[PDB]
Amino acid sequence: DVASFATKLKNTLIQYHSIEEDKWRVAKKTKDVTVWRKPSEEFNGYLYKAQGVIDDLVYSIIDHIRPGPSRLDWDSLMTSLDILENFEENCCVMRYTTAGQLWNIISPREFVDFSYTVGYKEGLLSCGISLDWDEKRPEFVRGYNHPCGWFCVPLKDNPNQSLLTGYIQTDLRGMIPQSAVDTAMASTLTNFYGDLRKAL
């Protein structure tokens, strides 16, 4: 049941990871992060893809990304993270909150997500998707993560480095100008890579 859900989610992420280059549009290119995006099939919005080299091993990187206190500590956007329920096969239900963005044009969000860590080729996939969850907290807008995840695999040249590929499909909900949404996604992805590299 949970295992079927998790396998479907994993297979969705693997499908994302095989989308060819011509379907993506470059959204942002820094010195060590590239960001693409395409229309989402899940909502009137974007599926984002991000890619960058991390100077660390795969298990270390995913240990920091996966739900838990380590993720909360280094991820500057995350302000709380609770594990709500644990399952077999490295699956759990977690809830996290984000700091306000853009001088609170984007007020704090809350997400309740399923999360699954699974081997992928020579590395790992940590993927997730929001679930329905009734407990409403009025000081947080309930955002919604469509299927999303982080692929992390050893690098071609140097296996002590890793290629980190993210797929991000967040609906912030509420009412936010499109320019702010695009700005906040770009800063979320660039700060993710920046904060993560500083923590390793």
Instruction: Quote the radius of gyration of the chain (alpha carbons, Å).
Output: 16
Neighbours of 152 (CB within 10 A): 25
Closest CA to 169 of 13, 65, 62: 13
Query: Residue 89 belongs to a domain with what CATH number?
Result: 3.30.530.20
Decide: 78 and 100 in contact? Cβ < 8 Å.
Answer: no
State how beta strands 34-39 and 46-54 pair. antiparallel
Pairing of strands 109-120, 141-142: parallel
| Tokens 């395409």 belong to residue | 38
Pairing of strands 123-130, 148-154: antiparallel
Q: How many domains is the chain built from? A: 1
Cα–Cα distance between 18 and 71 in angstroms, integer?
Answer: 27
Determined by X-ray
The stretches of 107-177 forming alpha helices (DSSP H) are none
46: which residues sit within 8 A by CB, 6+ positions away?
A: 37, 38, 39, 40, 169, 185
Q: Are 112 and 93 in contact (CB under 8 A)?
A: yes
* Domain boundaries, position 150: 1-200
| Residue whose pair of structure tokens reads 């499909």 in the numeric block | 169
Residue type (1 letter), 114: F
Cross-strand pairs, 77: none
